[PDB]
Design a protein around this ligand. Structure first.
Ligand SMILES: CC(C)(C)OC(=O)NC[C@H]1CC[C@H](CNC(=O)c2cc(-c3ccc(CN)cc3)nc3ccccc23)CC1
Ligand SMILES: CC(C)(C)OC(=O)NC[C@H]1CC[C@H](CNC(=O)c2cc(-c3ccc(CN)cc3)nc3ccccc23)CC1
Lengths: 654, 667
């Protein structure tokens, strides 16, 4: 017990059978107000496989593992689900054969993953592995013979390897070797054509059990909630498993590798790499978007899992867990967006008052609810989870400030150095387009609604960015949104803009059943900005036609026009901006309704509470409207355009 | 009379839209074998025009008479694959009508001809020669609006607001072209302009809802039907998006696929960085990154590339693959012999027109002249294309073994940038070639094509820069693409080729056992690690020393004998680890269907693919009436039906592919 408990702590990780006590303890932390802690906060049954190759809920004593993989079906008690929520907890045993994957490790991972898929409950995976198992025939190793090209003289080569007829006969019929009988020199010998071995998990068959678990993981992300935690290391198959599950928590001083540092130096020849953390540590994986969040220790990772889960429904057949809000809906929004650049997280989470202490300047979402993912990667777009009157939502927000990308130096070219790049705010770069698509896909498979705070000038059209695939990454936004199954609320806040190519990828017509567009009183939208519109449709000739109409002096002339030209151009710009308003967006029907920031929280809440209520009842629209008319009256029918009325009605009638 | 529009298109380096149908006709004559066996009405088409209710109607009319800068055609084409005819939808911009800009009607006519191709489940062909979303200003309000200056002496002080005189607010009806707040400044009535709407439709944000409409439709099209796009002259904004959402792109030389022009970007940067639109989205960029699958010198050569791509694709999303009678026999051996060292894998696929003599050809795996590659300059460690195996069209993916020389082109925005040469080791999946592979898998799956993988991978790139460039994300896209694969997948490791660890994992039969079939050659290899790797962890100096003591007569002083024997008994350990990596082991462990031989692999895999295709159609007819039956109820039915007709003496021949195909084709 303490021998395995030492081997794990010496490797910096948590011993596998101690993990459920980290879950029971973190549930106490997440729980609000003691004394009133619930009875049986954490209940579980260890998942083991029987000799029939089938899973069984049998409960034993810790340490008694015959395979280097441990799974548990658990029931957790949370503020979201106080009676309990179920998950499947798979984990690698870092003590047993150094966390390698053999047939028995692949099979348990598969059968527990298939059980979570059948129930539709979250699959939480704990990674600490050495990848697929490796093996040579040790029986054949201590018996095999060599036939040299010159028996003097090891140089010149080898003809083949053989077995003495006594030894070929001794290993039966056991099927461990394929041999061709040969009469050479004067002795009978069995040329080893193929080495098979009388053991499982020696080569090729460990890849079939790797493909098996990759395909299952691939499919789970599409039907259930998958979460992966990297502790110590994730190698080859272990690294691909975390990726296919998409939501990765990387502990500090851990690595997500495909091949090791020594292995890569051995192939390349020279000593390129220093460590495995270099190749796939936090500085690589938290920065390129493979890792969603970093944590100091395994305990903190256990907390981040439950934290993410608190935004997610119980299973794939249950709605989002809406909780009684502590922060009211009847409040205005203290924080006010500026015309110039600002941090979009203020717009979401609020901020401490700029001058006053210890005051808080409120934001769109409920205080303390805004939890961001993929923070260091593709900083021109903000991705995360939040709560709106207790409704957990997926959050996507454009960054308006110029950001800093630090491409690290390539240890492979000794003349390489870190490339520093500036990325302009309100722009979808190849990376930010990828991030926006990825968060769309991830939040859709969590069965979460989506909230986008829109502020985009367009996609980057520069040579490098076009070479780097912006066209391909922008197309993935259009499809992520088309495939969206829950409500999508698109909002342009005050002094924000959505221009040409950006609107086209998120418009109501891509998915009208989910997408709804809301524009602020002070927001803008058009094909080009006024400058672009002015240069094509409001040229110098028209500009001179305007002076010779409005200027009373313009009745010599060239002296008067050349003075007013930069002034009547400012006129043209202002004229063009008047065609880009929310007033025009409403007249044309491209948006649902014009919003006012201070009251946008309360409006969007009731509209969101409505849509989620309306969809559950459906799991047909005219049927819902007629049932309102039937119960409230044909005289009250005008209130069907009022969300609070309809919300309070749906919550009552049912 | 309309020859001026024809002259306006020639000067823009493109074809006039009403001349494209006659190019199709001519291209079908070129692609028709031996005259005069030319079929009656090789091309028959109708023009698709929108009615005033916004509905598509079939019209037989004279050219040059469209009142929207978009044109659509419902074409019936007589080809070798379908001699009685196949249907396509042809949509194209009209570069002479408001410079091919996308307005209200242009967007509705693209959406309606697309939905018709969706509803009919047939190919949708789009020819791009556009200018992106249409822009405009309210011209009426322009010659009438007033400026309220903050200091009118003195206009340099700025603008307070723009307004209307009481006179002009009345004149402007009942027209709803402006929105005003009534003001009393100084003493006279002024109607402040708050919002300019405009009389004419298709100015601002309504064009972007029309763009979102067609974007979402093309995105659906690609997933459901065959999508092909060609680029002539230019593809701007929404136009660039359309070609990409359709995925399969032919870019004509000298044309550009861009989001924003060089002039506008230079104004935005405040620096004269770009000199041409070609530096942004010309073939130098689009053909070198995968957005453009192929390039052609002119509009007629690309019209030929569409029909060429179509010759591998079924007539609709319901039909089977167009199987043509083979001119190149199935009964033949492959002449080209893969080497132990690197070779061009296009020699393994298409052969070569003979090394010594000249020669016609030294035969390859596929039928002569049938291999047609896509994405030639992009991610050169993987080869992607289409080909025919005894007249069966397939998607082709082959690992490249030669060390590829990648030229990273100079960034005119970056001052220290030069044309950089990077080395891409053969047999390795990099962030770019993993992406290229998953792109081909996903795209060929939507063509409803069987896939054939000629595998030779050492694994994925594990270096720091490559891990940072997303090799895990892209490698995972191979898993997701093969799992969702719907037609047979024939993976084969050629002679002297290898599949190691990480590379087998992404493509194993367990990902899609209903589709995936694994075959290995007698001279191929596979395992978790390369011999050198297996020997490094599992056959250490301790075991190496032990062997020296057991197999060396002299080793019975000691330390000196073994030190001069260690470099050689090490090579012996490599020989030992390599015999675990043979096809013999792969077959024993049940990881491969069978061990094949290079010479006879073409004959073998043809009858197995003919079998797989024939049986899948039987399985479909069966699971149409009773979708509760499985693949195995279908397997034993045909198996027992064969029993039981031919034997039971010939029962062992249910395992022979040619025999079952012969029984199938006949029965
Ligand atoms: C440069 C950064 C990194 C900021 O981003 C990009 O590379 N692209 C993002 C974005 C940039 C703005 C663009 C919208 N452009 C305009 O509204 C605009 C257009 C034209 C213009 C003129 C003629 C044509 C011909 N159709 C097109 C544009 N000229 C201008 C001059 C000054 C300021 C803005 C503009 C979207 C992409
Ligand atoms: C080769 C490059 C760096 C261009 O590509 C990669 O980044 N990844 C492909 C990679 C996949 C993993 C593989 C490591 N596997 C081994 O089996 C291995 C090979 C050799 C090895 C060394 C030298 C030679 C040349 N005589 C051949 C193999 N040495 C090792 C030492 C320790 C552990 C594993 C290995 C490497 C390829």
């Amino acid at each position: 017990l303490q021998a395995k408990r030492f081997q794990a702590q010496s490797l910096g990780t948590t011993y596998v059978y101690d993990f459920p006590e980290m879950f029971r303890q973190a549930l106490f932390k997440m729980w609000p107000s003691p004394d009133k802690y619930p009875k049986d906060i954490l209940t579980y049954t260890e998942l083991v496989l029987d000799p029939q190759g089938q899973l069984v809920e049998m409960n034993r004593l810790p340490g008694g593992n015959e395979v280097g993989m441990v799974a548990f079906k658990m029931t957790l008690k949370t503020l979201e689900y106080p009676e309990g929520r179920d998950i499947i907890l798979i984990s690698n045993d870092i003590t047993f054969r150094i966390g390698s994957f053999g047939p028995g490790e692949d099979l348990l991972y598969l059968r527990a993953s298939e059980l979570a898929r059948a129930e539709g409950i979250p699959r939480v995976y704990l990674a600490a592995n050495s990848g697929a198992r490796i093996g040579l025939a040790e029986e054949i190793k201590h018996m095999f013979q060599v036939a040299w090209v010159d028996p003097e003289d090891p140089h010149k080569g080898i003809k083949y390897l053989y077995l003495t007829p006594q030894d070929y006969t001794r290993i039966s019929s056991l099927n461990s070797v394929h041999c061709k009988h040969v009469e050479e020199d004067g002795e009978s010998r069995y040329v080893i054509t193929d080495i098979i071995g009388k053991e499982e998990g020696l080569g090729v068959e460990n890849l079939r059990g790797s493909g098996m678990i990759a395909g299952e993981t691939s499919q789970d992300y599409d039907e259930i909630v998958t979460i992966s935690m990297v502790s110590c290391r994730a190698l080859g198959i272990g690294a691909y498993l975390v990726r296919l599950g998409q939501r990765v928590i990387q502990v500090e001083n851990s690595h997500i590798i495909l091949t090791g540092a020594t292995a890569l130096n051995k192939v390349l020849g020279r000593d390129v790499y220093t460590s495995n953390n270099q190749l796939g540590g936090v500085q690589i994986m938290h920065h390129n978007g493979v890792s969603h969040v970093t944590v100091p220790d395994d305990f903190e990772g256990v907390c981040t899992i439950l934290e993410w889960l608190s935004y997610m429904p119980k299973d794939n057949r249950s709605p989002v867990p809406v909780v009684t809000p502590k922060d009211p809906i009847d409040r205005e929004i203290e924080f006010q967006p500026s015309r110039g650049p600002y941090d979009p997280r203020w717009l979401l989470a609020g901020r401490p008052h700029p001058t006053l202490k210890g005051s808080w300047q409120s934001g769109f979402f409920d205080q303390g609810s805004f939890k961001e993912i993929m923070v260091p990667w593709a900083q021109t777009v903000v991705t995360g989870r939040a709560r709106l009157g207790g409704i957990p939502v997926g959050v996507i927000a454009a960054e308006t400030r110029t950001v800093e990308l630090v491409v690290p130096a390539d240890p492979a070219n000794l003349d390489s150095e870190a490339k520093i790049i500036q990325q302009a705010g309100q722009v979808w770069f190849p990376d930010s387009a990828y991030k926006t698509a990825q968060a769309i896909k991830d939040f859709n498979r969590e069965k979460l609604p989506l909230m986008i705070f829109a502020n985009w000038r367009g996609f980057s059209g520069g040579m490098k960015d076009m070479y780097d695939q912006v066209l391909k990454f922008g197309a993935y936004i259009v499809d992520g949104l088309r495939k969206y199954r829950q409500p999508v609320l698109i909002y342009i806040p005050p002094y924000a803009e959505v221009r040409g190519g950006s609107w086209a990828v998120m418009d109501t017509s891509i998915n009208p059943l989910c997408i709804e567009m809301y524009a602020d009183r002070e927001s803008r939208a058009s094909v080009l900005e006024p400058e672009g519109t002015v240069e094509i449709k409001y040229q110098k000739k028209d500009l001179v036609k305007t002076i010779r109409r409005l200027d009373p002096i313009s009745k010599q002339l060239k002296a008067r026009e050349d003075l007013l030209l930069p002034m009547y151009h400012q006129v043209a710009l202002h004229f063009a901006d008047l065609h880009d308003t929310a007033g025009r967006m409403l007249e044309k029907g491209v948006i649902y309704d014009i919003l006012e920031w201070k009251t946008a929280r309360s409006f969007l809440y009731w509209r969101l509470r409505r849509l989620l209520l309306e969809s559950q009842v459906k799991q047909v629209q005219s049927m819902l409207r007629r049932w309102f008319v039937e119960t409230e009256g044909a005289v009250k029918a005008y209130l069907w355009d009022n969300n609070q009325t309809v919300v309070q009605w749906l919550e009552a009638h049912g």
